[PDB]
Design an enzyme around this catalytic site. Structure first.
Site, mmCIF file in Angstrom:
data_model
loop_
_atom_site.group_PDB
_atom_site.id
_atom_site.type_symbol
_atom_site.label_atom_id
_atom_site.label_comp_id
_atom_site.label_asym_id
_atom_site.label_seq_id
_atom_site.Cartn_x
_atom_site.Cartn_y
_atom_site.Cartn_z
ATOM 1 N N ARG A 296 41.882 22.353 -21.544
ATOM 2 C CA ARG A 296 41.763 22.493 -22.614
ATOM 3 C C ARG A 296 40.342 22.276 -23.322
ATOM 4 O O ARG A 296 39.631 22.383 -24.328
ATOM 5 C CB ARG A 296 42.227 21.733 -23.367
ATOM 6 C CG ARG A 296 42.390 21.754 -25.456
ATOM 7 C CD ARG A 296 43.619 21.213 -25.759
ATOM 8 N NE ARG A 296 43.749 19.767 -25.972
ATOM 9 C CZ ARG A 296 42.462 18.363 -26.279
ATOM 10 N NH1 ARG A 296 41.770 19.336 -27.184
ATOM 11 N NH2 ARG A 296 43.472 17.442 -26.336
ATOM 12 N N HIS B 141 37.599 21.647 -21.024
ATOM 13 C CA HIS B 141 36.496 22.581 -19.816
ATOM 14 C C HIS B 141 36.487 23.371 -19.556
ATOM 15 O O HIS B 141 35.265 23.890 -18.960
ATOM 16 C CB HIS B 141 36.175 20.814 -19.259
ATOM 17 C CG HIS B 141 36.266 19.643 -19.523
ATOM 18 N ND1 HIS B 141 35.231 19.567 -20.408
ATOM 19 C CD2 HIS B 141 36.932 19.030 -19.897
ATOM 20 C CE1 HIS B 141 34.864 18.346 -20.215
ATOM 21 N NE2 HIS B 141 35.749 17.611 -20.118
ATOM 22 N N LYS C 9 33.070 15.191 -30.612
ATOM 23 C CA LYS C 9 32.499 14.682 -29.765
ATOM 24 C C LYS C 9 30.915 14.982 -29.617
ATOM 25 O O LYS C 9 30.588 16.383 -29.561
ATOM 26 C CB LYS C 9 33.742 15.141 -28.743
ATOM 27 C CG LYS C 9 33.222 15.131 -27.290
ATOM 28 C CD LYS C 9 34.269 15.340 -26.145
ATOM 29 C CE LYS C 9 34.181 15.599 -24.497
ATOM 30 N NZ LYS C 9 34.906 16.322 -24.103
ATOM 31 N N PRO C 10 29.977 14.120 -29.091
ATOM 32 C CA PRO C 10 29.059 14.295 -28.388
ATOM 33 C C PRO C 10 28.162 15.456 -28.031
ATOM 34 O O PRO C 10 27.644 16.370 -28.188
ATOM 35 C CB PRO C 10 28.456 12.509 -28.371
ATOM 36 C CG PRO C 10 29.572 12.127 -28.160
ATOM 37 C CD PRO C 10 30.280 12.464 -28.314
ATOM 38 N N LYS D 153 30.176 8.184 -12.059
ATOM 39 C CA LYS D 153 28.929 7.885 -12.258
ATOM 40 C C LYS D 153 29.287 6.428 -12.035
ATOM 41 O O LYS D 153 28.408 5.250 -12.360
ATOM 42 C CB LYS D 153 28.540 8.430 -13.169
ATOM 43 C CG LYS D 153 28.265 9.511 -13.381
ATOM 44 C CD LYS D 153 27.125 10.280 -14.091
ATOM 45 C CE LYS D 153 26.714 11.384 -14.504
ATOM 46 N NZ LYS D 153 26.599 11.931 -15.786
ATOM 47 N N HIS E 10 39.130 14.511 -15.048
ATOM 48 C CA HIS E 10 37.929 14.276 -16.073
ATOM 49 C C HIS E 10 36.494 14.945 -15.526
ATOM 50 O O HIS E 10 36.549 15.024 -14.533
ATOM 51 C CB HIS E 10 37.675 12.868 -15.633
ATOM 52 C CG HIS E 10 36.353 12.089 -15.416
ATOM 53 N ND1 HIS E 10 35.366 12.098 -16.541
ATOM 54 C CD2 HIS E 10 35.697 12.363 -14.847
ATOM 55 C CE1 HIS E 10 34.565 11.457 -16.938
ATOM 56 N NE2 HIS E 10 34.390 11.275 -15.084
ATOM 57 N N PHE E 11 35.658 15.228 -16.219
ATOM 58 C CA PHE E 11 34.735 15.974 -16.071
ATOM 59 C C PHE E 11 33.215 15.373 -15.982
ATOM 60 O O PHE E 11 33.111 14.724 -16.885
ATOM 61 C CB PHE E 11 34.614 17.180 -16.691
ATOM 62 C CG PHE E 11 33.171 17.966 -16.066
ATOM 63 C CD1 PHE E 11 31.796 17.487 -16.275
ATOM 64 C CD2 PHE E 11 32.777 19.202 -15.394
ATOM 65 C CE1 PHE E 11 30.419 18.350 -16.241
ATOM 66 C CE2 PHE E 11 32.144 19.860 -15.680
ATOM 67 C CZ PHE E 11 30.899 19.390 -15.530
ATOM 68 N N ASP E 12 33.217 14.949 -14.403
ATOM 69 C CA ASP E 12 31.935 13.860 -14.467
ATOM 70 C C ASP E 12 30.405 13.968 -14.569
ATOM 71 O O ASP E 12 29.747 12.816 -15.565
ATOM 72 C CB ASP E 12 32.021 13.017 -12.898
ATOM 73 C CG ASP E 12 31.458 11.547 -12.773
ATOM 74 O OD1 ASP E 12 32.420 10.719 -14.087
ATOM 75 O OD2 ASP E 12 30.520 11.319 -12.241
#
Length: 124
Positions: free
Chosen positions: A10, A12, A41-42, A66, A119-121
């Site tokens: 949803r 990404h 969301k920034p 990261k 998760h998108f890093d």
């Protein structure tokens, strides 16, 4: 509740377009995917590839995230991505974003069985 894998899709995935086609892409997508419901969301990244090709990254190059975790993976190939970043005029609930289209490698964190992105890093 929504699973981590579903949330990744949803937040990404946009397999329906090959690239952002106008400056309003991020404004539209951040709203439509419910990413601005509680707050703006920034930053967010959308990936314009098939879900299967993104899932496949979990079997590619293992790298540190990261934050130091070691369940991250970097794509062998570059992918079409859109970066969305909040602009100076953004003010909840009217969140506003700058749209930047790019071709980069992606780094995702993977979990579970099946082992999938959650998760998108980063993009590099």
């Amino acid at each position: 509740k929504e699973t981590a894998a579903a949330k990744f899709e949803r937040q990404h995935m946009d397999s329906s377009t090959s690239a952002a086609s106008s400056s309003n892409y991020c404004n539209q997508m951040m709203k439509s995917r419910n990413l601005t419901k509680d707050r703006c969301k920034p930053v967010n990244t959308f990936v314009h590839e098939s879900l299967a090709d993104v899932q496949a990254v979990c079997s590619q190059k293992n790298v540190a995230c990261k934050n130091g975790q070691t369940n991250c993976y970097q794509s062998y190939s570059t992918m079409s991505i859109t970066d969305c970043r909040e602009t100076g005029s953004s003010k909840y609930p009217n969140c506003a974003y700058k749209t930047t289209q790019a071709n980069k490698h992606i780094i995702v964190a993977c979990e579970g069985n099946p082992y999938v992105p959650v998760h998108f890093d980063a993009s590099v």
